[PDB]
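Agenda item 2: nickel (II) ion complex prediction
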Amino acid sequence: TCPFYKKIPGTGFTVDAFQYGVVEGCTAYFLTHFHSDHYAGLSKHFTFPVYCSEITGNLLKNKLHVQEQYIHPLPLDTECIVNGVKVVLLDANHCPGAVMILFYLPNGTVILHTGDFRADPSMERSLLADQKVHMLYLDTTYCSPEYTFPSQQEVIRFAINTAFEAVTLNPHALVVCGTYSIGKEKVFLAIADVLGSKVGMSQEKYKTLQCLNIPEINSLITTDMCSSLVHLLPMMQINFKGLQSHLKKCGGKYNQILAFRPTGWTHSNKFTRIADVIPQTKGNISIYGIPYSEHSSYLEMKRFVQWLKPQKIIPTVNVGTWKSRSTMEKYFREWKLEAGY
Ligand code: NI
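Presented output:
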């Protein structure tokens, strides 16, 4: 059964609610983005209208085989009427195709559902500038002040400089980058661009990337692993055993691996600067964990909410424990008392 924080009151709509069977009263199912915890339940046998971005709808059709007649892609930044209700899709600054959804309820209430997002000051000049928001369904993944991490631009500068130094010192080094979902494509694309290579990957991952509307993508990726010196592997293989095994398969072309594991936050963030990050090394294999986040830091989240000034907040992450719920409610009240709304 579908939980309350996935239902939009005063509508027939649900958000990210495909794992509960037929939800009573739902006339349109929205999908914020193509991550498995959110799409869980969708397949070629789905027969209700799904509303989403163009990119999400390319993934639903090619990867999950949902039939075309049930996929309703909406353009971004554009007022659309769905089943008698005005909606807008906004870029969420999460993975490719990820959106926030503005709902203009028939009674005058305005609701923002963030989906998953990484808050940014540029959202203060989107279509959100133009009217009041009563209710905020908020991605609270990192809603605690210990969650600090650098900008995505600082993390990519670190990765590119690290990879270019290593391969210039040793032209026989291979670079490997872990992946298990869409998102974080800048890591492997930025490193392949500085090295003058395409990114090599499996047929299944090439297929996924071909759905993402990235400009000039045919110039950037390949399934011919032998022609490439940046390889993508599943995240589970980014360990010393997995990497040793991969290096064997390369037929003596390479004699060293430098590997990247983009994580979210880890507790090594509480003490060390991005500048000072060091790898784990065994022999001719070195592994860097890099804190590339596609979710808001605590500070980015707090700035967004203090600007928006919602009347009510409904968290969508960390909702399962009383301690997490009480912690998040305390910070929301701090924010509100500090800013005066
Ligand atoms: Ni996500």
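Discussion summary: The pocket of nickel (II) ion is lined by residues 33, 35, 94, 116 (CB under 6 Å).
Owner for follow-up: CH.
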